[PDB]
Amino acid sequence: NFASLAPRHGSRPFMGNWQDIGTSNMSGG
Amino acid sequence: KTAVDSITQKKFLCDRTLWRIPFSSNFMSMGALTDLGQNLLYANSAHALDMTFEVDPMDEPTLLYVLFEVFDVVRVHRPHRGVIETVYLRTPFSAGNAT
Amino acid sequence: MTFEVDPMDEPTLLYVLFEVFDVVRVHRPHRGVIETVYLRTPFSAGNAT
Amino acid sequence: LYPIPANATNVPISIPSRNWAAFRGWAFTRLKTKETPSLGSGYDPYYTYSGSIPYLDGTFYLNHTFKKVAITFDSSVSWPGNDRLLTPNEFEIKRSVDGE
Amino acid sequence: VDGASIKFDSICLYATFFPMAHNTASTLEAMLRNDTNDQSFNDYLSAANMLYPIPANATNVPISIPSRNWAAFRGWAFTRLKTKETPSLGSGYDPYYTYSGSIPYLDGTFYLNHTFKKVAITFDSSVSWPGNDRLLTPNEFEIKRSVDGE
Amino acid sequence: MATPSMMPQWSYMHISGQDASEYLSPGLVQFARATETYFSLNNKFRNPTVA
Amino acid sequence: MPQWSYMHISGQDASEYLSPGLVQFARATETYFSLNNKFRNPTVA
Amino acid sequence: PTHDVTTDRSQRLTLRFIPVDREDTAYSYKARFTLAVGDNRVLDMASTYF
Amino acid sequence: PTHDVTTDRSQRLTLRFIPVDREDTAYSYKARFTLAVGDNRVLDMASTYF
Amino acid sequence: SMMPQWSYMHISGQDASEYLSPGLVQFARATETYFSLNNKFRNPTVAPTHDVTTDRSQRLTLRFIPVDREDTAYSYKARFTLAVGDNRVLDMASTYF
Amino acid sequence: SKEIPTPYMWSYQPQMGLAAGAAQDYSTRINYMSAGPHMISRVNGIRAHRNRILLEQAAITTTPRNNLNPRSWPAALVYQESPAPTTVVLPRDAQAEVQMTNSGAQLAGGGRPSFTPRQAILTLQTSSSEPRSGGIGTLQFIEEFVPSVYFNPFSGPPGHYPDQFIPNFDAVKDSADGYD
């Protein structure tokens, strides 16, 4: 599940968040 | 009686026209949708095209204008008042749209 | 490809041999019939420049 | 539009890999870069010419400057293949030297 | 210019036949007309010529292939020639060919091999070949060096 | 042979398939055949030709 | 509207319309090769 | 070997071929032959020459 | 992470691209490049500049 | 159409003992001493692509600086570390000074 | 896109006789970004009716195999030429002409002799010594390698993902090839 690509903090992968994959940056909203 | 020794130069000029090469198995127009365009080889697979043009040299930047002949087709629906729905398909050089 | 040569006071030519498989298969199915299929790979007849 | 430089003889083009479904054929004519405006852009500042535009009106005149055409599908299979023509692997349009 | 001329009187075509037995040579005939018994041959050089011009006192020769499937590619083989010593072949008569010595393009009498400094081969305009830090100078084929400090 | 793959797109955009006397509704063909001399509908509908 | 959903003006977020292998790839490699600003998320009022 | 190696009918080893058409140019010339290989014979083209 | 992160082959971190067809004018300048991304590589266009 | 082009032209495929008809292989071995059919048929030679040569960064020739040089009036001593890395073999015939 | 995907159309390589690699049918796509729900729904039913044909065409025509695009097709699964055996009517009686010639007769020219009623007929195998394996032709690339409709793409554990769509992937290396 691509967890061997993540830096191990301890014994577990430091995977990111699901909700951070997109972007909604837009001027004024 | 004193004609000089001569050599013949032959050429042609064919203006206003496009050098058509039809994608047909006998080079004939047996219909707009050709027999090789319907063929299972060229329509269920992906093929690289590598065309090679040898032209006369000119002392000027020139362009090579190739007409890849397609089916540039539009279907138009007007289901309601003031609604104009169009769908465009051209094959093989599609603009494209997914689902 | 980029070749760097010694300079010479003479117009010279560079002779590069792209080594291919210049192969012929010769078919003779009937009397007085000589049929050949030529193939070279990569620089095929029609994709050679 | 494929560019041909000055005094250039052989111009190879390529199409990467593609479904050729409902393909009809080819048609081609040499143009001039001076006469053809850079369309797609809404204005051409490099276009110092106001004659006829053969790209737009069909007044083609450089048809006689073609020697041969070689169409190969899939980088080794020549088209039409199948030993169709007296020159087997290409479409020779004209010959300056005709020995045969 | 030097008055040499050649006249060709006649040609015959001589063809030596092996006097094979007529039902041995009929068996060999009908075996070799089978479409799996086709006599397949091979050019020994097995290469596509490209003559690239080098001007007088010119050092770099940049050549470029646009795009091609490189399958069954065997390698390169390069040697500098001379334009005086190489006829414009393909044409049936070169009227500007004022030379009648050895033609290294045709007989293998190559002698300008020592005039090569280095060779840089890059695939896809970005990737050096062979790459992979194979050579002591990995980006190019340094053939000879005038300045060697290492 | 013709590809069964392409046939849904080709019959919809009328690259192959039925002519305009076959896929149009029979009231519209009767309308277009009657008013042909003064209000033509002939060049509005694409007829496929198949090799 | 099917064209707001095609261009992701309204609809699913990038954790949902993308392939689940790409979401797991972009979540693992986020600290050194971020794929986050490559895909547009809808913000629906 | 005794049999099935060499015939015993009247058959030439080397044939001579007259040019059917010769087209002479100023810078070249052309010779055209009829390389007639008869029945029950095989010709290796390495044994051919002008 | 050790494996399947960084390649074990040779690969330039930064590439240099000479223009293919540059054109100079008194009012503008045009430069045409080949932005050739090699195989087994990805290029984020934020890392590209002139 | 019926065979690939490397196997039609015999670039990668069967040797002449395999694609020829069995009567012709029997004929070409019998008449080999007086009517050779050997150079008429193309035999492929295929280089191996797997488990032979690496596809990683690896230097063919290394250049070792001396770890300790030691000059004398009658002799000269150079000390090297001929380090053979992971998953590499070194034939000492290729080594020289 | 996941429910009604675009089919991966296979690229052939005529030299190796294998499939190069499959990319999606981007070049036969139909543009409904200017259509409404009266016609987007009708085109999406044509995208899906095409994908039902390709699963039906693959169930009829494609050979059932574990590895998609294998690197060496077996000899039992490759179309092979099996011609009729060649029947050779041998022209001359060998030992009946060495007795006419030893008796002093000069034979020249050419049952077929007037001095021999014997007639030998030889029947030879036309096909190859060994059946060919390794690479399929053009016509068997058409029958197999029907374009892959890959529903819910790249969602199953990796290693189950189709890597044989990629034109760089060796199956027996499990790695993408490089420049050296």
Can you give a write-up of this model?
The structure is cut from a larger assembly and holds one copy of chain A (29 residues), nine copies of chain B and one copy of chain K (180 residues). Chain A has 29 residues and is mainly β. Helix content of chain A is 0%, strand content 14%. Chain A has strands at residues 8-9, 12-13. In chain A, a hairpin with a 2-residue loop joins strand 1 and strand 2. Chain A is elongated. Chain B is mainly beta and 99 residues long. Helix content of chain B is 4%, strand content 33%. In chain B, a hairpin with a 7-residue loop joins strand 4 (73-77) and strand 5. Chain K has one domain. Chain K has helices at 37-61, 94-102, 138-143, and strands at residues 8-13, 18-24, 30-31, 86-89, 121-124, 169-170, 175-176. A two-stranded antiparallel sheet of chain K has the order 1-2. The two termini of chain K are 36 Å apart. The chains are: A mainly beta (29), B mainly beta (99), K alpha+beta (180). Chain J binds chain K through residues 1-7, 11-14, 17-23, 25, 50, 55, and chain K through 14-17, 79, 81, 124-130, 132, 134-139, 170, 172-173, 175, 177-178, 180. It is classed as virus. The entry lists the keywords cement protein, dsDNA genome packaging, genome-capsid co-assembly. Improved cryoEM structure of human adenovirus type 5 with atomic details of minor proteins VI and VII. Chain A is Pre-protein VI. Organism of A: Human adenovirus C serotype 5. Chains B and 8 copies: Hexon protein.
How much of the sequence lies in strands of chain K comes to 15-25%
The end-to-end distance of chain K, rounded to whole angstroms, is 36 Å
SSE topology string of chain A: EE
**How do the strands of the widest beta sheet of chain K line up side by side?**
1-2
Strand order, sheet with most strands of chain A: 1-2
The level of helicity of chain K is 10-25%
Counting H and I runs of at least 4 residues, what is the number of helices of chain K?
Answer: 3
Largest interface: B-D, 53 and 59 residues
Number of domains of chain K: 1
Annotation field: number of helices of chain A: 0
Shape call of chain A: elongated
Largest sheet of chain K, in brief, is: 2 strands, antiparallel
Helix- and strand-based class of chain K? Answer: alpha+beta
Cα radius of gyration of chain K in angstroms = 29 Å
Helix content estimate of chain A: under 10%
Give the quaternary arrangement of the chains.
part of a larger assembly
How would you sum up the major sheet of chain A?
A: 2 strands, antiparallel
Which value, in Å, is the CA radius of gyration of chain A? Answer: 14 Å
